[PDB]
Swiss-Prot record, chains A, C:
Residues 1-76 form the Ubiquitin-like domain. It comes from Homo sapiens. Changing residue 63 to R: Abolishes HLTF-mediated polyubiquitination of PCNA. This is Ubiquitin. Exists either covalently attached to another protein, or free (unanchored). When covalently bound, it is conjugated to target proteins via an isopeptide bond either as a monomer (monoubiquitin), a polymer linked via different Lys residues of the ubiquitin (polyubiquitin chains) or a linear polymer linked via the initiator Met of the ubiquitin (linear polyubiquitin chains). The modification ADP-ribosylglycine is found at residue 76. There is a cross-link at residues 6, 11, 27, 29, 33, 48, 63 (Glycyl lysine isopeptide (Lys-Gly) (interchain with G-Cter in ubiquitin)).
Swiss-Prot record, chain B:
This is 26S proteasome regulatory subunit RPN1. Present with 306000 molecules/cell in log phase SD medium. Acts as a regulatory subunit of the 26S proteasome which is involved in the ATP-dependent degradation of ubiquitinated proteins. PC repeats lie at residues 7-41, 42-82, 85-117. Belongs to the proteasome subunit S2 family. The lineage of its organism: Eukaryota, Fungi, Dikarya, Ascomycota, Saccharomycotina. The chain holds residues 482 to 612 of 993 of the full protein.
Length: 76, 131, 76
């Protein structure tokens, strides 16, 4: 499912994931896109904050869903 | 107990309208971004950035200021600093691109605590409405 | 190489280290100079916290590098 990831700063990233995909996996994909280390990406959805391990299914996150992302200070 | 911090904020204090230096955020930000650091001193610092960078604003400034916002313990509510903190997230923006709109969306993303004060306040100020 | 350490005040400490030198070793040198114990130091560079054991080479820390000396949650 083509999901969207909106960053607090101001940038939307399109990532093709699945319902069984693990949050940790998503973070990895983001790192491959930008350069923000996984241990520096706070994902949040309509519900609350998403933790590692869990899957995009334990939140009902469907397709075209905008996931908020708050990085901990400049990655680099 | 005249902490060295005084001598620090002092120098910069004069660099306020200096000419935009990288020492401002290079010292203030950390004191209020590193991870925790005293909220008090950090409070007055946060304001320094607002008034100063009142014109040009940046996300990194908010993001960092946000990280600390969450780290809140809701236990230190004893000391006064919620005012400056709030006014900051306000004066910071002033309309440019549903910027604030996104902010309020985040605060709600993580439940709805006593942040009401911010919601309402920041909620009022947003689009054009001050002439 | 000659590296520098900027303090959260305005003072910059210059110390002669090597690329194989271990962070822990550096912190030790700082303790001998100032008075801050290792278990009370946080070296950051390019927005990246340095971990003990590692060396100044595992962080691409060349010479004339201004290491940001931050206090990990100062007691007082």
């Amino acid at each position: 499912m083509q999901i969207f990831v909106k960053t607090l700063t101001g940038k939307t990233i399109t990532l093709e994931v699945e319902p069984s995909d693990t949050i940790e996996n998503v973070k990895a994909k983001i790192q491959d896109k930008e350069g923000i280390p996984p241990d520096q990406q706070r994902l949040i959805f309509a519900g609350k904050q998403l933790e590692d391990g869990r899957t995009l299914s334990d939140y009902n996150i469907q397709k075209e869903s905008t996931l908020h992302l708050v990085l901990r200070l400049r990655g680099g | 107990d005249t902490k060295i911090s005084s001598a620090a904020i002092l120098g910069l204090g004069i660099a306020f309208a200096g000419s935009k230096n990288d020492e401002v955020l290079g010292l203030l930000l950390p004191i209020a971004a590193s991870t925790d650091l005293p909220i008090e001193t950090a409070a007055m610092a946060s304001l320094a950035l607002a008034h100063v960078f009142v014109g040009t604003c940046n996300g990194d400034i908010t993001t960092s200021i946000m990280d600390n916002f969450l780290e809140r313990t809701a236990i230190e509510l004893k000391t006064d600093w919620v005012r400056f903190l709030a006014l900051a997230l306000g004066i910071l923006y002033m309309g440019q691109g549903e910027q604030v709109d996104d902010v309020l969306e985040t605060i709600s993303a993580i439940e709805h605590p006593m942040t009401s004060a911010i919601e309402v306040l920041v909620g009022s100020c947003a689009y054009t409405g001050t002439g």
